[PDB]
Every structure is written in structure tokens, then in C-alpha cells.
Structure 1
Amino acid sequence: KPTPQSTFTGPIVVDPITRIEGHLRIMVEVENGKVKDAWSSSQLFRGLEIILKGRDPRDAQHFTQRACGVCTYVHALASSRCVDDAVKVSIPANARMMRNLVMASQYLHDHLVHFYHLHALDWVDVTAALKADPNKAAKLAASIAPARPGNSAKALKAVQDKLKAFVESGQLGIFTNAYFLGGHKAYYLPPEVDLIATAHYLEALHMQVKAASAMAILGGKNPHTQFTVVGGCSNYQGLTKNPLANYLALSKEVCQFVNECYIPDLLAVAGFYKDWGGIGGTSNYLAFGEFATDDSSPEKHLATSQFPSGVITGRDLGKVDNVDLGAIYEDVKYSWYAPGGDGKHPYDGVTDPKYTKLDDKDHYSWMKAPRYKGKAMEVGPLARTFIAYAKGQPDFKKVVDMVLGKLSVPATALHSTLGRTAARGIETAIVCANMEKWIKEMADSGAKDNTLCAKWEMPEESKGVGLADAPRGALSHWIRIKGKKIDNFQLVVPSTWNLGPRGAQGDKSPVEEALIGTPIADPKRPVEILRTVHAFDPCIACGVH
């Protein structure tokens, strides 16, 4: 019944954090088997903001997209919203629709790959799946998930035979030295549940191809879409009947996989790890919102996002504040940047790299520390879910209540690594339930009038901000234009909010705070650190840029 926990006292360093995007080192101090202090240390700088200075503002989206190829598209969208705001163009309704649908397709691809290919191996013992009875596994699957041929005893046995041949080869490949090899106290699942999840892990490798193909019908290609322009979008063909029929068909298949496999696996896994509802919580949440009906300005985005925007402080769901874009700043006191750079609003952002040395407690990360009124903010699916739920958004109320009921927990149980993981699935289901409506809206509008790009003029001097809620959370790009060129271009990215270091007052970031109190069953295989870190869905290329 109790959560396994050793008596280990001492430091643990985990570097590389694998099954994330990018290069992260986590350092913790452990006393009597529980984490007592933590540091989130991002280990690569590229400097896209420096590279952009003096370039054509039209080029920004193509450079910033390469901040990250996991959350591909999202930086092209934020940069396009940013430059659209700076030149004061309102994009056509069809462009709003197409950009938002590409964002929806990205949520689907991204969250499915995250749960299965990045997170699941923290919770699922793949080698234990070889001990399962495939007939027992099928019967269990039939009780917790909709009927499907992939969950049959024959299908589960084929997965098991394939895994068997692979493990027995002695070339374990990506499973080499896995934390679950030879059993591990922190892995709770019955072998049958391991096998069902492993079968779906493999299926998801094929399904993510379909999710990306759907995205590419509108986006041109995946990764790194190529269909946005200043003023709107370029892809007239994406408004036509046959491409949209194919986009719908592929989306429906992906959503069937979300509803049949992802959500039931997520619930089954969460059911066994209810103790993780009491580990890894934080208190403050931020979202810029996504899927707006009016994207004519950043203020209209914040106001009309269907996944709503807002600020929650101190877990107080009774008081959702509106976002104040002027309250955002970034500190560098504990980061690898030059002195003097603390407290900068992104319009006045500075990016002056200055490395010291590995594990220097005074400067330990290439990420800046974004703060909001002096507080750290968690961003991402859990932030969006709490904000929507507190505001009474009807799809979030329904799906959140469904989960709380299934797990038999109060909403406060969601301030945790388990809640963070559940929230990712909750919103994936909600995006899926909206796809057909959004596709019909664009098919009808695009048939009526295929206007997709507005006319615009480059100003000599201006500023603009582009907001998006990307799969990992609140994303903002900020431009100052001078002499029709980029004078300043600052990215403040969801993983910067979640996984940056301490701010100017020495206050831990959300992941640093979340790691305090983590139990460690075996300090040589600290899967519990990975559970919380992975729940934030880190992207270090995003966070540092």
C-alpha cells in the first residue's frame, strides 16, 4: 500500500534526461529517500534571438520554427501572429480557421507521442508484459476499453511474441539498461496492463504517421510546416473538398485511437498510481488560450479562445484573473547570461550568453526564468484544464468530471504529477470532439469565398506580440521593428516557464518545486524523477532557443 522509498541520503544527477526533446540535466539533493532540493539545468544554447537581429521580419517564422521540431509549427504560428500584429493586419477568417486546425492536428500528434513514446516507459514495465496471459489481457481490455481487433487475445499474443524474440536476442536496443529491467519497486502495473499498453505503444508508432499526414494536408509537410505567410496562409488547396475529406478521414482514425486506446490506457495507468496524485504539485497556472474565434488582435485572442486564457494563483480556482501581457518578464540571475538582465519584459528582452561552469549554483541553466508579478507559473495542459474547469467551460467540465469519477479523487488531486499527466489526455479528447465541427466550418467558409491572405504593408517602426497555447503551454513571440528590420525578437516559451531555473528572488521554477518531496525507491534507477519531469513534457530546444 505505501509508496516505495529508500533511505538514500546524498546527491543524484540525471544527465541526460532521455525521452524529452533536447538536453536537460536534473540535479537533486536527497535525504532519507526523498528529494529535498532540486535544480533544472538546460545544457544547450543556440541563440535564435541573436541570429534574428537585423533580418527581414517576414523571415522570422522560418527561423523560429526551428526552435523545435517536436512542437513543430507552433513557433511559425506565434511568429506569424507576432508579425501580423506588428504590421496591424487582420488575417481572413479562412486563415484563422486553417491556422487553428493545424494547431489542433499538432496537439493530437504531439500528445499521443508524448504519452506513449516519451512518458509510458516510466510507468509500464515492458519486460513484465512477457509474463502476461494474452487471454487474460484480452478479457481485461474488453472491460476497460471499447471493443477493437487490436485488443484481441491473438493480437496481444503477436505483440508478446515479437517482444519476446526481441528481448531474447540480447540486443535490447532502446530498452538497454531500462529502469524496469529485473523488476523495480516503483513499477506497480499487473503484467496484463503492461502488455495492453505495450501493444498500444507499437500501434501508436503507426498512428502518429497518420496524425502527421493529416497535419500535412493543411501544413504542406510535417515536420516543419510551410503554409503561413504574413496576412494569413498560402495553401488554397487546403480549402478544397477532396483534401478536406481526406483530412477528416485521417483525423477520425486518429481520434478513434485517442478514445479507444490513449484515454483508457491513461485511466488504467492512473488507477494503479493513485499515490502520484499526492506528488509533484505546484500552485500557479497561466494560459494564453487557444482556438480563438477572433484572432484579429492579441486581446481578441485572449478573450475568445475556446480553450480559455487566464491566471490562477495559489490553487484558488474561485479567482481566474485575466492575463496581463505587461506583467510578464524574464530574469537571468541564475542563468548563463550576463549581469544586469533581470526583470525584462520581452519587448525589452536581452540575450547576452555568459557561461560559467557545470553545476555552478549561482548560474546553472541556459533557460531564462520567466515570472509573472514575481511568481513562477506552470503552463500547459494542466494549466489550461484548471483555467477552463474554473471558468465552467462545458467540454472541460464534462471530461474532467469523467476522470475525477473514474479515479475517485477530488479536483485538488489534480495539483500533482498524476493530474498533469491526466490533463494532457483530457484536452486531447476535447480537441478530438471538436475536429469535425471545425473542419465543417472551414470547408463551408472556404467553398463560399477562398480568401486566405490579407493585404498589408511593412511599417518603418512598430512592435507586436503573437500568442499561442502550444501543446506544452503559453507561447509568446515579441518583435520590435526598426527601419523595417528586426531590432529585437524575443521568444518566451512554455518550457521556459515550466523548466527554467530560479528567478531573481531565488524562487524555484515549477519543475524544481514539483520535484521537492519526490520519493526515490532506488537511487541508481530514479524513475520517480523522470515521472515528474516527463509529466511537464519538457522541450529544451524550445525553452532555450
Structure 2
Amino acid sequence: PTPQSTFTGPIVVDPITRIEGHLRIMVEVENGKVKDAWSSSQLFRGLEIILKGRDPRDAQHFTQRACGVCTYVHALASSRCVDDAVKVSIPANARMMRNLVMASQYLHDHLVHFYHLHALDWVDVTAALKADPNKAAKLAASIAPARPGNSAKALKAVQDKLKAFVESGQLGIFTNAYFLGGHKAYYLPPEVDLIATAHYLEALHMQVKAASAMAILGGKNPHTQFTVVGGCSNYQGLTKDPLANYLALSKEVCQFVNECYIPDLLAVAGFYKDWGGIGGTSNYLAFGEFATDDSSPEKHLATSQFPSGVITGRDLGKVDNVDLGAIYEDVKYSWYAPGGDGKHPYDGVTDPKYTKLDDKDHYSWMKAPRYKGKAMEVGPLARTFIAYAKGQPDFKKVVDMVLGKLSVPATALHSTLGRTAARGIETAIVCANMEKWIKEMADSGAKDNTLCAKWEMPEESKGVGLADAPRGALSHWIRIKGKKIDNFQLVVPSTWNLGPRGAQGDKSPVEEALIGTPIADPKRPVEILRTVHAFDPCIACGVH
């Protein structure tokens, strides 16, 4: 069964590595299972304060620097936000180009997260040294598509490289790893460790290509520079050779998704099937992404191909529409001044006030976003459940493939394993849509290259920009007064997932998911990392 100590006491993990940003996790453990949790974000920058009084056209450039991991997404949400505030409807080519860049972001973001951020929670790299490479080649044939990268020779070269590295005594990023000397929570056969380690290294190269693809349309990566109020600036991105290169590069990236990412995810998921009973939450939210109609926030919600919705209490039979008026943020357990509870983002307040480390009354730089009083999990799992509930055919098919491979019910996805699985599921689906989406823009841009619409700065207005970023439901909210930024508020997916308690004292999604986490070894609490990493935390995003 699942290894579990008899440990009773506190565990603090700070820093949480292999995330973006600065997170401290505090838990109380009783008899080897987590009984209470706190998600404590440790950096404030204050972009919303910085934005006040500025030109609304500048917003996207400041807010993109909320995060370099989910690069682009904030420039996009800010652009959608200001487009809405000035009431301009972007041209078709701009919708298409903006959406493809998001699709590119998903591919790069999710590949890097699985291999370079999450995998080391499940894969013992040093155990790969014990594998026989011929036995590993055989096993690779039985869990994944045939590929030369999975040959005995290829897997030996990886093993030899790893061996020479370990024997040098400079373990670099593997220094003091939780798997060193073995660990009861690490289940994989050495051969699977070897296989995944080869892909880890391959993935370091593949992500370069995924970023290059994105940069053809985005101008550069990280931090794209192609969006403007009224659409996009990149006329070159509608032309033939750049689109052929973008398709060619996207197809390499997707071949790697299908040959390596999904099969490694499924292999890991098969060995860690017990993680289907750990780390579940109840409520899910998505604003949707990949809309056919982005003329307004309402059209986005209604036409997103990855649909929007609200699920509550795991009830897959009742996907509610998103009520943007029902979103608010609490500050009661956060490092902000008193009086700031229950604020809709149009009326958001960001008034920093620190107390002290591990003050249970005020313990995070994140606000606590709530929806009609409820915490909401956002991200790939939220999107996957909403699409599945709604019978979106790509999700129904891929989810069913996953449930069939694992021989598990759909309820098993309400867990850390499901959260991890959902991230791959939607990456496979983005991949299967790339060519159709690329052809739509190629053909459209051939016929007419309109990319940016005319618009006028209002004296006073407000607007909202919605996106489902790789980590989930993202919204930027502006008030314009005297043609300047009067208020600008970001509510970001990691704020939804990893923020603290709201005004009712109610745990956020990560805090709730942490309850019942078993700890095989309190010295080396990988189980905390597993669940926290599955939410794909971005603390610079969460706090801004």
C-alpha cells in the first residue's frame, strides 16, 4: 500500500522549488497524514499599484512581467481587457493569431512543467544508473511509440552521461534530492527511471523548438511583442514561409508530445495509481480558451473551443455559466490592510501590510479569490472536467482513452494524479488542433491581411479581459478615468489555486488538496511536492 510514517508534528517546506516564484508551505501532520495546511506566498511586487495613473496602452507591457513562465498570457489578458474598455472588436486575423500564440504557450509550458518541474517528484534519476539499457529498450517498446530515441544504444548514451556526471561528485541540481539513497514513495522500476530521464534531457532541447514556433508569431520568447490595442502588429506572421516554419516546428513538438510526454505520463500514472485517491478538490472554474468569437468577454465565454463553466461539489451534471459579477477577492488572511474583503476586481484594493512570518491570521501575499463564497480550482483539470461534462468530443475521446488505459473511473481524476493527467490530456488536444488552426489563419491572411482595427480612447470606461492560461482562469480588470488607468486589477489562476483562506476561514484549493497527504518520510516530504506541483504554481502570477 501507500507508504506512510507515524509522524505527528509540523512540516515547513520553504522554498518550494520547481515552481515559478516564492512559496512556503506549512502543514500539520498527524500519524503520517497531513491534517492542516497553509499556502504562504513570500514575494510582493505590486504591479497593480505601479499601473495606477499610467497610459492604458502601456498596461500589457507591465502586466506581461507578472510572469516569464506563462509569458504572453498577461499581455493577452491586458490586451483583451483594454480592447473591451475601448469597445473595439479585433479583426479575425488578430483573434486567430492571438489564439495560436496561446496554443504555442500551452505546448511549451506543459512540456517544461511535466519534465523539468514535476517529474523529479516521481522519477528517481540516480536509480536510472541501475537499469539495464536493453531491458529498458524492451520496456520502452511496450509503453510508448517506436522511436530511435528509445533504442538501447540511445538509452545507454543517456545512462553513460548520467553515470559520468554522478561519479564526478558534482550533482548540481540533483544535490540533496529526496530520492537520493532510495525513498519509499518512489515506485518506478530503474528502467522507467532511465526512460523518463532520457526524455527529460530530450525535452530540454524540444522546448527550444516550442519557443521558436511561438516567437514566429510572437516576435520573441520570453515576453512576446506583437499585440496592440485593436489586434496585432505582426503582418509577417500571416505570410507563407513563416507559417510553414511554424507548422513544421509545431509538428516536431507534437510528435514529442505523443511519443514521449503522454506515454511517460501514463506509465507514471499506472505505477502511482494510489495517487488517484489523494489531493482532490470539489469546485472548478474556467473562462474557456480558443474562442471562435472574441468580440467581447461574453462571446469569449460562450464560444471558447475549450469551454467555460463552473462545476460545484464534483457535480458533472450541472455546468453553470460563468457569472463575472460573482467573482471577488478577500484579504482577511493576507498581508493587506483591513477593510479589503469581498471586493469585485473593478473595485479591487491593493494596500500592502506585512505582519510577520507564519502569522496564522495573515500569512500570504496572495489575495483569496472566491466565487459566491466558494473557492475554485482552475487549470487543466478544471478545463478537462468542464469539457468532459459538456461532451466536447476531443476531451471525451482523450479522457476516455486515459480512463481506459488506467482502468479507473472518471471520479479518479478528482486527485493529484488526475490534475497531472489533465495537463497532458489537453496538451494532446491542443496538438491535434494546431494544423486546422494554422490553416485557418494562413488561408484568412492570404485573402486579406487586416490585423488591427481602429479605435478611440474613451475619457471614462471599464473593461475585462479573460483568458484560460496554461494554469487556468485569468482576468484583467481596468477602470479608465481621464483616459488614464484609474484602477487595474489582475486575478490570476495561481491566486485562485494557491491563495490563502478567504474571509470565512475557508481553505483554498491547494490547502484543501493537501489534507490527507500521506508522508512516508517526514525528513523528505515528496508527497507535499507532488500535490503542490500538480497545481503548477506560479507565485509571481498569484501575487503580481
TM-score (norm 2): 1.00
Aligned counterparts of 2:80 and 2:364: Cα–Cα separation in 1: 29
Aligned counterparts of 2:366 and 2:64: Cα–Cα separation in 1: 18
Aligned counterparts of 2:142 and 2:92: Cα–Cα separation in 1: 44
Quote how far apart the aligned CAs of 1:11 are: 0.3
Aligned to 2:161: 162
Aligned counterparts of 1:116 and 1:34: Cα–Cα separation in 2: 27
Quote how far apart the aligned CAs of 1:390 are: 0.1
Structure 1: where are the runs of 5+ without partners? Answer: none
**CA deviation string 1:459-511 (max 9, x = no partner):** 00000000000000000000000000000000000000000000000000000
Aligned to 1:497: 496
Aligned counterparts of 2:195 and 2:378: Cα–Cα separation in 1: 31
Aligned counterparts of 2:522 and 2:169: Cα–Cα separation in 1: 25
Aligned counterparts of 2:267 and 2:308: Cα–Cα separation in 1: 30
Aligned to 1:101: 100
Quote how far apart the aligned CAs of 1:154 are: 0.0
2:10 counterpart SS class: strand
Give the share of equivalent positions with the same residue, in percent: 100
**CA deviation string 1:255-284 (max 9, x = no partner):** 000000000000000000000000000000
1:89 counterpart SS class: coil
Quote how far apart the aligned CAs of 1:290 are: 0.1
Aligned counterparts of 2:523 and 2:16: Cα–Cα separation in 1: 14
2:65 counterpart SS class: helix
Quote how far apart the aligned CAs of 1:143 are: 1.4
Quote how far apart the aligned CAs of 1:144 are: 1.4
Aligned counterparts of 1:422 and 1:10: Cα–Cα separation in 2: 31
Aligned counterparts of 1:289 and 1:191: Cα–Cα separation in 2: 40
Quote how far apart the aligned CAs of 1:133 are: 0.5
Quote how far apart the aligned CAs of 1:117 are: 0.1
Quote how far apart the aligned CAs of 1:340 are: 0.3
Structure 2: where are the runs of 5+ without partners? Answer: none
Aligned counterparts of 1:318 and 1:373: Cα–Cα separation in 2: 20
1:144 counterpart SS class: coil
Aligned counterparts of 2:421 and 2:383: Cα–Cα separation in 1: 12
Aligned counterparts of 2:520 and 2:175: Cα–Cα separation in 1: 20
Aligned counterparts of 1:14 and 1:209: Cα–Cα separation in 2: 31
Aligned counterparts of 2:481 and 2:139: Cα–Cα separation in 1: 63
Aligned counterparts of 1:235 and 1:422: Cα–Cα separation in 2: 35
CA RMSD of aligned residues (A): 0.2
**CA deviation string 1:110-161 (max 9, x = no partner):** 0000000000000000000000010010011111111111000000000000
**CA deviation string 1:76-116 (max 9, x = no partner):** 00000000000000000000000000000000000000000
**CA deviation string 1:357-388 (max 9, x = no partner):** 00000000000000001000000000000000
Number of residues of Structure 1 aligned to a counterpart in Structure 2: 544
2:142 counterpart SS class: helix
TM-score (norm 1): 1.00
Aligned counterparts of 1:450 and 1:409: Cα–Cα separation in 2: 48
Aligned counterparts of 2:244 and 2:477: Cα–Cα separation in 1: 36
Aligned counterparts of 1:140 and 1:393: Cα–Cα separation in 2: 34
**CA deviation string 1:39-79 (max 9, x = no partner):** 00000000000000000000000000000000000000000
2:465 counterpart SS class: strand
**CA deviation string 1:282-304 (max 9, x = no partner):** 00000000000000000000000
Aligned counterparts of 2:166 and 2:532: Cα–Cα separation in 1: 28
Aligned to 1:451: 450
Aligned counterparts of 2:455 and 2:135: Cα–Cα separation in 1: 63
1:100 counterpart SS class: helix
- 138-147 vs 24-33, which moves further: 138-147
Aligned counterparts of 1:345 and 1:70: Cα–Cα separation in 2: 27
Quote how far apart the aligned CAs of 1:318 are: 0.2
Quote how far apart the aligned CAs of 1:534 are: 0.1
Aligned counterparts of 2:502 and 2:142: Cα–Cα separation in 1: 48
Q: Which runs of 4+ in 1 moved over 4 A?
A: none
**CA deviation string 1:8-67 (max 9, x = no partner):** 110000000000000000000001100000000000000000000000000000000000
Aligned to 2:181: 182
Aligned counterparts of 1:506 and 1:366: Cα–Cα separation in 2: 16
Aligned counterparts of 2:295 and 2:138: Cα–Cα separation in 1: 52
Aligned to 1:349: 348
Aligned counterparts of 1:407 and 1:64: Cα–Cα separation in 2: 40
